[PDB]
Amino acid sequence: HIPEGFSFNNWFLLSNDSTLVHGKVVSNQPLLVNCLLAIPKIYGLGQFF
Amino acid sequence: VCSNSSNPHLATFAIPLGATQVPYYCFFKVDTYNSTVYKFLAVLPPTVREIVITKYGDVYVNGFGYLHLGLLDAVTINFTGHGTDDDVSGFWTIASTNF
Amino acid sequence: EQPISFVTLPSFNAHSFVNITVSASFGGHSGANLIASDTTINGFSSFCVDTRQFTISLSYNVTNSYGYVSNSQDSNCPFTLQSVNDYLSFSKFCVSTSLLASACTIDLFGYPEFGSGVKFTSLYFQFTKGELITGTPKPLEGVTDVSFMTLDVCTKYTIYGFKGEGIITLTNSSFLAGVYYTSDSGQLLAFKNVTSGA
Amino acid sequence: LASACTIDLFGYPEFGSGVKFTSLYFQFTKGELITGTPKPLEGVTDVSFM
Amino acid sequence: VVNSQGAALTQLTVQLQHNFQAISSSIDDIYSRLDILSADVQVDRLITG
Numbered sequence: 001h002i003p004e005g006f007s008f009n010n011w012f013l014l015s016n017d018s019t020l021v022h023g024k025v026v027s028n029q030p031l032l033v034n035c036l037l038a039i040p041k042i043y044g045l046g047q048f049f
Numbered sequence: 050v051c052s053n054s055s056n057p058h059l060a061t062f063a064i065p066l067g068a069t070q071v072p073y074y075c076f077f078k079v080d081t082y083n084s085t086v087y088k089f090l091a092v093l094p095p096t097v098r099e100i101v102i103t104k105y106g107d108v109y110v111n112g113f114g115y116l117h118l119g120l121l122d123a124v125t126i127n128f129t130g131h132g133t134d135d136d137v138s139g140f141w142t143i144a145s146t147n148f
Numbered sequence: 149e150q151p152i153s154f155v156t157l158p159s160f161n162a163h164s165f166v167n168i169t170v171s172a173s174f175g176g177h178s179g180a181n182l183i184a185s186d187t188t189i190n191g192f193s194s195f196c197v198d199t200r201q202f203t204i205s206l207s208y209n210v211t212n213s214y215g216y217v218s219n220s221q222d223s224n225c226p227f228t229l230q231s232v233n234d235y236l237s238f239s240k241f242c243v244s245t246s247l248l249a250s251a252c253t254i255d256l257f258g259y260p261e262f263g264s265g266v267k268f269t270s271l272y273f274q275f276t277k278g279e280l281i282t283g284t285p286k287p288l289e290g291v292t293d294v295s296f297m298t299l300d301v302c303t304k305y306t307i308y309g310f311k312g313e314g315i316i317t318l319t320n321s322s323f324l325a326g327v328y329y330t331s332d333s334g335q336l337l338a339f340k341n342v343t344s345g346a
Numbered sequence: 347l348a349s350a351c352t353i354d355l356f357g358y359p360e361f362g363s364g365v366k367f368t369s370l371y372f373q374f375t376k377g378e379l380i381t382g383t384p385k386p387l388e389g390v391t392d393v394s395f396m
Numbered sequence: 397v398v399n400s401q402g403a404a405l406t407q408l409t410v411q412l413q414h415n416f417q418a419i420s421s422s423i424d425d426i427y428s429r430l431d432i433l434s435a436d437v438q439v440d441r442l443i444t445g
């Protein structure tokens with residue numbers, strides 16, 4: 001689970017068309033995380049996923 | 050492959066590039082074992098923050114889902130990540146998102 | 149005299165001409181019956197568009213003793229032969245003379261006034277909704293961005309595949325998400341200028 | 347055949363064009379006397395098992 | 397009771413978006429893309445519903 005206390009400034013809802021200006025909704029979204037990499041160096045060597 | 054009005058070969062693909070040099074004109078090269086064609090889709094937006102790619106071929110930019118493709122299996126990433134470039138690295142975080 | 153406004157995603161002038169040509173004769177076999185009929189899509193049996201802007205063109209080459217052949221079209225797809233030149237937006241577009249999966253059939257009939265009419269051929273369209281393909285009646289010359297509009301007047305607008313009638317105005321709002329905003333009435337009231345953010 | 351639906355088979359050899367090999371017609375009626383199993387049952391006197 | 401009386405108006409807009417066995421819920425969209433006959437039949441269905 002994602003920890004609480006995040007502004008989520010660089011995050012947006014996954015929408016095919018249009019966007020909800022304000023409100024609430026429940027849907028399946030890509031939120032569960034297995035691993036996180038930050039301040040990276042290795043992808044400059046042709047990293048493969 | 051994206052270039053700022055510097056297209057030694059993409060200019061042949063798109064003779065009337067238009068606009069000016071400041072905006073970046075991006076292209077998708079359809080490389081395969083039969084042809085190496087270059088396609089133009091859109092011009093670089095001034096600001097890009099979050100980019101999402103799905104396993105089913107759907108790409109999402111700024112929560113739009115600009116393009117959709119077929120089945121995907123792997124990907125390769127390269128830039129100037131020469132150890133000391135992480136300070137001005139263009140990637141903040143990369144994660145394995147799940148539905 | 150409603151002004152016309154057309155705005156889509158910013159792109160340069162990438163125009164192509166797709167042509168369907170039909171050639172047949174009627175005055176040789178029986179007058180009311182054909183001899184040979186050939187249909188070519190730019191000299192080929194099938195084609196697929198690639199450029200953002202494309203223009204359809206249909207050409208008739210019919211020979212008969214009477215000299216007059218009535219042309220009729222049987223339509224099953226949501227768009228007709230001439231309606232495609234009305235600022236239509238798509239993602240994938242392919243045309244063929246042979247059967248293809250998930251493709252509707254459009255029929256062309258010729259009546260040489262001899263008493264009997266015949267179907268020349270059948271057309272198959274494989275089309276997907278989207279934005280990367282635009283259908284314009286004529287090419288745009290000396291145009292860097294196809295989008296053009298008029299502000300603060302009543303006008304017939306076609307924005308992002310939705311056509312309506314109204315007055316368009318500029319608002320001093322800032323938003324970093326989406327390209328258009330809709331209400332619970334299906335009306336696309338708010339849209340953003342992607343190049344400028346307005 | 348009368349009162350028979352059509353099932354189509356398409357082959358795309360990746361050369362750019364795909365073609366339909368043929369069409370299949372099934373004349374079927376609801377009932378009990380015909381059963382479709384993924385595999386045959388060996389050494390079974392009564393197919394019913396639960 | 398105040399929320400009960402303030403309700404029962406929002407759903408009136410909802411069924412406008414609903415499509416009654418027609419190509420699209422926008423009458424202007426349908427009228428300018430397909431022949432007048434079937435478009436008239438479909439808009440008759442829409443107005444009746």
Ligand SMILES: *[C@@H]1O[C@H](CO)[C@@H](O[C@@H]2O[C@H](CO)[C@@H](O[C@@H]3O[C@H](CO[C@H]4O[C@H](CO)[C@@H](O)[C@H](O)[C@@H]4O)[C@@H](O)[C@H](O[C@H]4O[C@H](CO)[C@@H](O)[C@H](O)[C@@H]4O)[C@@H]3O)[C@H](O)[C@H]2NC(C)=O)[C@H](O)[C@H]1NC(C)=O
Binds near residue numbers: 114
């Ligand atoms: C925007 O528009 C796009 C279309 O471009 C939509 O994308 C579709 O999203 C749905 C939802 O995920 C996709 O459906 C998925 O298909 C998977 C592939 O199916 C195979 O596997 C199933 C068995 O699960 C077989 O029966 C089938 O024959 C295929 O062989 C399914 O597997 C998915 O179901 C399961 O997924 C995982 C797999 O383990 C499970 O964890 C799940 O719980 C679930 O059981 C799922 O049904 C669909 O393929 C997408 N289409 C395309 C073209 O990409 C977007 O949904 C739409 N909306 C948004 C917000 O983007």
Ligand SMILES: *[C@@H]1O[C@H](CO)[C@@H](O[C@@H]2O[C@H](CO)[C@@H](O[C@@H]3O[C@H](CO[C@H]4O[C@H](CO)[C@@H](O)[C@H](O)[C@@H]4O)[C@@H](O)[C@H](O[C@H]4O[C@H](CO)[C@@H](O)[C@H](O)[C@@H]4O)[C@@H]3O)[C@H](O)[C@H]2NC(C)=O)[C@H](O)[C@H]1NC(C)=O
Binds near residue numbers: 166167190205
């Ligand atoms: C698919 O279909 C399109 C539409 O018909 C075809 O484009 C037309 O091509 C024909 C010739 O094949 C053009 O007819 C003549 O073309 C000459 C040279 O063409 C160039 O210049 C014209 C403008 O003059 C451009 O439109 C064209 O794209 C070329 O850049 C012209 O010199 C001729 O001009 C004469 O007629 C005009 C009109 O009467 C006069 O004003 C002139 O003074 C002169 O007398 C003539 O136009 C035709 O113009 C093309 N139309 C368009 C819209 O492009 C494609 O060729 C066809 N492609 C395939 C593969 O089938």
Ligand SMILES: *[C@@H]1O[C@H](CO)[C@@H](O[C@@H]2O[C@H](CO)[C@@H](O[C@@H]3O[C@H](CO[C@H]4O[C@H](CO)[C@@H](O)[C@H](O)[C@@H]4O)[C@@H](O)[C@H](O[C@H]4O[C@H](CO)[C@@H](O)[C@H](O)[C@@H]4O)[C@@H]3O)[C@H](O)[C@H]2NC(C)=O)[C@H](O)[C@H]1NC(C)=O
Binds near residue numbers: 067068293295341342
């Ligand atoms: C909001 O939506 C609108 C809808 O199109 C878009 O507006 C863009 O930004 C400006 C706003 O008008 C426009 O582009 C600019 O045009 C200027 C003037 O154009 C010509 O004007 C006369 C003819 O009347 C010519 O003689 C003159 O030479 C201009 O070419 C230009 O000054 C701008 O750059 C031009 O000059 C430089 C000088 O070096 C050249 O290098 C350039 O190639 C170019 O010729 C500029 O082109 C136009 O309306 C839109 N421009 C686009 C889409 O590129 C935008 O989508 C959005 N608004 C903004 C501000 O983004």
Ligand SMILES: *[C@@H]1O[C@H](CO[C@@H]2O[C@@H](C)[C@@H](O)[C@@H](O)[C@@H]2O)[C@@H](O[C@@H]2O[C@H](CO)[C@@H](O[C@@H]3O[C@H](CO)[C@@H](O)[C@H](O[C@H]4O[C@H](CO)[C@@H](O)[C@H](O)[C@@H]4O)[C@@H]3O)[C@H](O)[C@H]2NC(C)=O)[C@H](O)[C@H]1NC(C)=O
Binds near residue numbers: 171172184187209
């Ligand atoms: C309208 O259509 C006619 C009919 O031509 C053809 O009709 C169908 C059978 C079908 O194949 C169509 O696709 C096709 O248009 C056009 O009239 C002639 O069209 C042919 C094209 O097939 C032109 O080229 C010819 O090609 C033949 C195959 O190689 C060749 O044998 C021909 O040579 C012979 O031509 C005549 C018979 O037409 C014969 O009398 C001669 O002695 C010679 O052997 C020829 O190279 C022709 O140039 C077209 N014109 C003539 C007069 O034949 C027509 O051009 C087209 N467009 C119009 C009317 O605007």
Ligand SMILES: *[C@@H]1O[C@H](CO)[C@@H](O[C@@H]2O[C@H](CO)[C@@H](O[C@@H]3O[C@H](CO)[C@@H](O)[C@H](O)[C@@H]3O)[C@H](O)[C@H]2NC(C)=O)[C@H](O)[C@H]1NC(C)=O
Binds near residue numbers: 039135138139140141
């Ligand atoms: C994300 O991108 C920004 C934008 O480039 C990065 O900011 C950059 O950070 C580096 C080092 O922190 C700056 O280099 C140093 O700047 C100071 C002045 O602050 C200067 O005195 C030094 O000599 C050295 O040049 C760089 O200037 C700065 N960029 C800008 C435009 O100011 C940021 O580091 C990136 N973050 C990650 C995690 O990569």
Ligand SMILES: *[C@@H]1O[C@H](CO)[C@@H](O[C@@H]2O[C@H](CO)[C@@H](O)[C@H](O)[C@H]2NC(C)=O)[C@H](O)[C@H]1NC(C)=O
Binds near residue numbers: 082084
């Ligand atoms: C890909 O398909 C095309 C046509 O079926 C073929 O590619 C050609 O390959 C030869 C030899 O490598 C080149 O000289 C040609 O230039 C290629 N064609 C094109 C259009 O570029 C070949 O059959 C296939 N190539 C594979 C399977 O590797």
Ligand SMILES: *[C@@H]1O[C@H](CO)[C@@H](O)[C@H](O)[C@H]1NC(C)=O
Binds near residue numbers: 044045046047127128
């Ligand atoms: C990644 O790109 C750099 C360009 O500077 C190149 O030197 C390097 O060989 C590339 N890595 C791979 C694995 O191709």
Ligand SMILES: *[C@@H]1O[C@H](CO)[C@@H](O)[C@H](O)[C@H]1NC(C)=O
Binds near residue numbers: 052053055
């Ligand atoms: C893009 O512009 C930069 C200047 O900021 C320049 O150094 C670079 O060479 C340009 N891109 C290409 C492909 O030339």
Ligand SMILES: *[C@@H]1O[C@H](CO)[C@@H](O)[C@H](O)[C@H]1NC(C)=O
Binds near residue numbers: 318319320
């Ligand atoms: C937006 O800015 C102010 C309020 O923020 C307002 O007075 C002004 O008239 C608006 N400008 C527009 C709508 O162009």
